[PDB]
């Protein structure tokens, strides 16, 4: 027997234990030590299932998120579902499932960071292009949400207003190989990477690790926060077997990107919260950065199943980090064909604010130090 809220976390614990030790912890007696912050976790559960912290439009709107310790890669809270009036043990943990499109939140890790990393761009002020543009190799247009084109704009503003044209084109200038490599270093992969992926975590498999889940996004954005170091998500700290033996799990890092890249990305993403999209996640007293996401429906879907004139979406996403914690939010309905309307779209950002409020208040919120090889200028940062 076990608590209501812990269901999702234990499921991953069991999965991780037998991946590293090869023992289903239900068929073998062993004491296992985890990274779950109980208070934080109960607080997470409280944001989902009350009227205290977030105003929901209805009882079946889903939220799914994962919170990581940026310094070691320890998942401290996870919750893939809200309101579960059918308690069957260890259900489908949506928080690690990848079968939903993370849309624009893929831009930072797939497009601009690698672009900067491999020195395709020199500054957060480099002028990039939002003009009529086509997916390379095809006569298919890359539309923006507003169907318009902002023209000549800076990289920073491009990320902020979240324009699809400069995003896609930037994937083309990085190269598809380089990008697949960069995503791997951030723990994300596709069987096959395509230009569509510059604005979508939409994959062909999702049989395993392919695509993006709140797990893999939290793990990726933590690298932005700590200066470019990816840690594999961890749930377990130590195992003690019946036979007295003990295996401790030390979580080691890998260089995902240069510290200057990690910084430049952070700096731009700061403006997302302040001047642009995720203002519903803005905290005046907390040094944080993020990217919003609003996926869309397919051509088939638009005509046959979705019937409205309004701004609608199957998924709304947020992916923010502070100096200490990384958190990635997914929102939507179990059946994708139920669209997100008006107020439903703010939930992702509001959820993050609420949970980030809790973890940060008390300890002094430290900002990011501008590191060797970068200097400050106007609204932007430049290299050397």
């Amino acid at each position: 027997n076990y608590p209501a809220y812990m269901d999702n976390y234990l499921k991953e614990v069991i999965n991780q234990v037998e991946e590293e030790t090869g023992y289903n912890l239900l068929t073998t007696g062993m004491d296992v030590y985890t990274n779950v912050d109980q208070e934080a976790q109960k607080h997470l559960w409280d944001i989902y299932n009350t009227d205290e912290y977030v105003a929901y439009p209805d009882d079946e709107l889903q939220v799914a998120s994962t919170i990581v310790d940026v310094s070691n890669g320890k998942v401290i809270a996870q919750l893939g579902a809200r309101h579960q009036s059918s308690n069957v043990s260890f259900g489908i943990n949506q928080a690690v499932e990848t079968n939903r499109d993370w849309g624009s939140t893929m831009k930072p890790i797939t497009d601009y960071a690698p672009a900067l990393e491999y020195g395709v761009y020199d500054s957060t002020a480099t002028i990039v292009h939002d003009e009529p543009y086509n997916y390379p190799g095809t006569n298919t247009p890359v539309y923006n949400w507003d169907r318009g084109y902002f023209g000549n704009i800076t990289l920073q503003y491009a990320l902020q207003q979240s324009r699809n044209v400069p995003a896609v084109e930037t994937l083309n200038k990085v190269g598809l190989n380089r990008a697949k490599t960069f995503l791997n270093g951030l723990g994300i992969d596709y069987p096959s990477i395509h230009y569509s992926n510059a604005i979508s975590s939409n994959t062909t498999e999702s049989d395993k690790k392919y695509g993006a889940s709140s797990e893999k996004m939290a793990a990726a954005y933590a690298a932005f926060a700590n200066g470019g170091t990816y840690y594999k998500p961890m749930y377990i700290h130590k195992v003690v077997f019946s036979d007295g033996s003990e295996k401790e799990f030390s979580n080691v890092g890998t260089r995902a990107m240069k510290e200057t890249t990690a910084y430049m990305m952070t700096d731009m993403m700061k403006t997302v919260l302040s001047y642009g999209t995720g203002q519903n996640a803005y905290l005046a007293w907390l040094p944080q950065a993020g990217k919003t996401g609003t996926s869309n429906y397919t051509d088939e879907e638009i005509e046959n199943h979705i019937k409205t004139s309004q701004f609608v979406a199957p998924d709304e996403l947020f992916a923010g980090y502070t100096r200490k914690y990384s958190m990635a939010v997914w929102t939507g309905y179990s059946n994708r064909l139920t669209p997100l309307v008006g107020n439903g779209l703010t939930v992702a950002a509001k959820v993050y604010r609420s949970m980030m409020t809790y973890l940060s208040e008390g300890s002094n919120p430290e900002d990011w130090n501008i590191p060797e090889g970068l200097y400050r200028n106007g609204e932007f940062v430049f290299k050397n």
Binding site: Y2, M6, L10, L25, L26, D31, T34, Q38
Partner: peptide, 16 residues
């Protein structure tokens, strides 16, 4: 048979 789960503080939270 019987397994015990402990949070980040090391306090028991689940028995499986």
């Amino acid at each position: 048979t019987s397994s015990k789960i402990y949070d980040n503080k090391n306090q028991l939270i689940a028995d499986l």
